């Protein structure tokens, strides 16, 4: 169940310059964008909408907060770099992903909210924030940042990965006996590139033996990667 969500974010962030005649005539102008958050997250809606929105646009990749926490607290200097290159790339889409001591995270998040709010510029670029859990983020970010729309992902576990699995396996070839009860029952906090990654390493693992059929025990062996990926991080 994501058709209304993808036409609502399609109309939400594709109303600007890409087909713009329905945006600068009515006089609404919510030039703040949405903040992506998914209960599973981890590239499912982030990657799915990150590749689905690239039909005709300019993408800006910002993934992970490691470069801030792996060393001294440089802080908002790289935010100023991405803001001057986002200023030199104004008709783009600012996509910040994987937003994951606290005395400094609060001040670089306060300065991040201040510079991100558009305190020195009007609405010209669509800023998109992304995270795994929307509850870890302090509610003080919602009012300045989100004024346009926030999207929840009410996924049906069978028909989200069975519809995405069906569409994504209707053009390419695969193997038989592909079970789904352990998938919809066990998989959590993973993406569609992960079921595509285990079908690709499943059919590729069968390709190592030069076979086109995949055994159920081989699909559980590839499933173990999913079983440990959610337990590691």
């Amino acid at each position: 169940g994501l058709d209304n969500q993808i036409q609502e974010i399609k109309e939400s962030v594709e109303l600007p310059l890409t087909h713009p005649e329905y945006y600068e005539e009515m006089g609404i102008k919510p030039p703040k964008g949405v903040i992506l958050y998914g209960p599973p997250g981890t590239g499912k809606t982030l990657l799915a909408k990150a590749v689905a929105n690239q039909t005709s646009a300019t993408f800006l990749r910002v993934v992970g907060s490691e470069l801030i926490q792996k060393y001294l607290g440089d802080g908002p200097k790289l935010v100023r770099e991405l803001f001057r290159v986002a200023e030199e790339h104004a008709p783009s889409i600012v996509f910040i992903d994987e937003i994951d001591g606290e005395r400094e995270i609060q001040r670089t998040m306060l300065e991040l909210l201040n510079q991100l709010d558009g305190f020195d510029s009007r609405g010209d670029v669509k800023v998109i924030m992304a995270t795994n859990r929307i509850e870890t983020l302090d509610p003080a970010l919602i009012r300045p940042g989100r004024i346009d729309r926030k999207i929840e992902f009410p996924l049906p576990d069978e028909k989200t990965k069975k519809r995405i699995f069906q569409i994504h396996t209707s053009r390419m070839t695969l193997a038989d006996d592909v079970t789904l009860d352990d998938l919809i029952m066990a998989k959590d906090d993973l993406s569609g590139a992960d079921i595509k990654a285990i079908c690709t390493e499943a059919g590729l693992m069968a390709l190592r033996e030069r076979r086109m059929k995949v055994t159920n025990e081989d699909f559980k062996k590839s499933k173990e990667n999913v079983l440990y990926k959610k337990q590691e991080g």
Binding site: L15, Y23, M26, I28, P30, F119
Partner: protein
Amino acid sequence: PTVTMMQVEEKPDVTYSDVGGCKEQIEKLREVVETPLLHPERFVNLGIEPPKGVLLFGPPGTGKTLCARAVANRTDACFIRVIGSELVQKYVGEGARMVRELFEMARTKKACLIFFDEIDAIGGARFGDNEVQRTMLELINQLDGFDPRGNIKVLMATNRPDTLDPALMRPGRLDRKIEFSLPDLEGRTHIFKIHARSMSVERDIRFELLARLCPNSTGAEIRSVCTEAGMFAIRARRKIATEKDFLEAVNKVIKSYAKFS
């Protein structure tokens, strides 16, 4: 920083017609913010010092809209508001030179009106607090103290009346503490009367009908109603807004969002 020049609010905005049923309270606070502007010399001829300000607090409701009202109705020179978000910041102590430089700008802008929003940021110390004691005791020495002047406008807006010191220090200089009195069943139709200048409104819409089936729907939520009206009007390619079209947006935005809140 750039907030010191952001304190100026040009580009006029929402006018008097967003009064949320406070037909008398808007006089009980306009009497100090806008009345001493028409004839300031006549108050000096009266002998009494011009009034200082009032106190708005209680529920949020349609808060911060009355400052835009005070921007549009003041057609002479916009005023300066000080939100409490600039007080709770790292490396405290900047608010002293900040309030002295915005008071300096107040003396430079021929007695510019000064506003103070969100006192609850540093309010309620209940004595790490000494650095707050400096900013709030100096804040009393600069606001309740007659150092700048007993003059035109002093005001504190907040969501909690738990302020210990300002409540026992205001009666000397400040006065007229009144509740917010958010609009209920008689102000939302008038917020629709100021939203009449939005996207074309068909004369079939009854503001009372759209304003009576929405409990706890102050200017923010019905502002989102008038926002989703034009938004879904773009999503449906409609040329004129009619309540019978976006009624699903109304009962959706109040009911589907009032289920979990």
